[PDB]
Design a protein around this ligand. Structure first.
Ligand SMILES: O[C@@H]1[C@@H](O)[C@@H](O)OC[C@H]1O
Ligand SMILES: O[C@@H]1[C@@H](O)[C@H](O)OC[C@H]1O
Ligand SMILES: O[C@@H]1[C@@H](O)[C@H](O)OC[C@H]1O
Ligand SMILES: O[C@@H]1[C@@H](O)[C@H](O)OC[C@H]1O
Length: 302
């Protein structure tokens, strides 16, 4: 645990949280990791426990052991929770992707959103209702949901989410929304404008922000472009930067800090060894679970 909480300092600027992720294993593999989370971060996103494959492995049969643990840990420690993720083409059981009948997929989609959301009704700050639905060119990804239901699945997912838990902020999340002018950003902005204009309840846009070295300075403009979609808020949902340089991390923090719609930042992991991109050392804490330079730099900029 770092003596200075970057979460506490970010919140001091009117922001809602600067969080990270977790699940049973990383919350118990040692004493330092959970201690870092409780001291320096104020929000948690389950790393894998809330996804389709982990929650509904078989049609109509749910498994909530992992997600229960993550939610309970967060709630027991005053951590805001971001549900992740309801509708996605990756980590999706084969029984879903094999469905060809429209009405049958709609029934399934709604049952999954309803059961997973109902179980944590009132405890979830935000839900990533839809994840990675765009192709790099800004067009809709031909996932099973898109191929079988059509564009209407977007309305269906959000409208089900809204009615089931009107307390959660409904988000559409995606990666590569990292520079103004990029085709995917334009595609995300134009589609959300259209969807909001039609009455679809999309409260926020989540930008993953999985960066390479040197990509930090462009994030500010990306957030500015996304703000044009017209959503109530936006957020950096899965932040990590190869090399974890102070320049890149501070640039990303300032990008959010200086944009009024950006409510928070979630670092996709606490320490490097537990990162999904571990070979690049893209996190704020090192192999010894000690604050790296970026963590202190982020602290001194707030
Ligand atoms: O629950 C996740 C599952 O998809 C597994 O296959 O890969 C990592 C796990 O945490
Ligand atoms: O519904 C309960 C859920 O809200 C809690 O988080 O974990 C245990 C479940 O029984
Ligand atoms: O899905 C991957 C995304 O998470 C990463 O940021 O960039 C490469 C993609 O394939
Ligand atoms: O643990 C990994 C998770 O961080 C990533 O988001 O999805 C793939 C998983 O293997």
């Amino acid at each position: 645990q770092a003596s200075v909480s970057i979460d506490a300092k970010f919140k001091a600027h009117g922001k809602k949280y600067l969080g990270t992720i977790g699940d049973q294993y990383t919350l118990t593999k040692n004493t330092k990791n959970p201690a870092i989370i409780k001291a320096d971060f104020g929000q948690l996103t389950p790393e894998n426990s809330m996804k389709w494959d982990a929650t509904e492995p078989n049609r109509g049969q749910f498994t909530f052991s992992g997600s229960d643990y993550l939610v309970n840990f967060a709630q027991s420690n005053g951590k805001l929770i971001r549900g992740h993720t309801l509708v996605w083409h990756s980590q999706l059981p084969g029984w879903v992707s094999s469905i060809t009948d429209k009405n049958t997929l709609i029934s399934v989609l709604k049952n999954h959103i309803t059961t997973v959301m109902t179980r944590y009704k009132g405890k979830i700050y935000a839900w990533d209702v839809l994840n990675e639905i765009f192709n790099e060119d800004g067009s809709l990804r031909n996932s099973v949901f898109y191929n079988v239901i059509g564009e209407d699945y977007v309305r269906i997912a959000f409208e089900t989410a809204r009615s089931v838990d009107p307390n959660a902020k409904l988000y559409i999340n995606d990666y590569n929304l990292d520079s103004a002018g990029y085709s995917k950003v334009n595609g995300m902005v134009s589609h959300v404008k259209k969807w909001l204009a039609a009455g679809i309840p999309i409260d926020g846009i989540g930008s993953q922000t999985h960066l390479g070295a040197g990509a930090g300075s462009a994030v500010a403009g990306a957030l500015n472009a996304l703000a044009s979609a017209g959503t109530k808020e936006i957020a950096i949902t899965e932040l990590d930067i190869a090399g974890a340089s102070s320049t890149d991390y501070v640039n990303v923090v300032n990008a959010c800090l200086n944009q009024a719609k950006c409510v928070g930042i979630t670092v996709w992991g606490v320490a490097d060894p537990d990162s999904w991109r571990s070979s690049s050392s893209p996190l704020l804490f090192d192999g010894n679970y000690n604050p790296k330079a970026a963590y202190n730099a982020i602290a001194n900029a707030l």
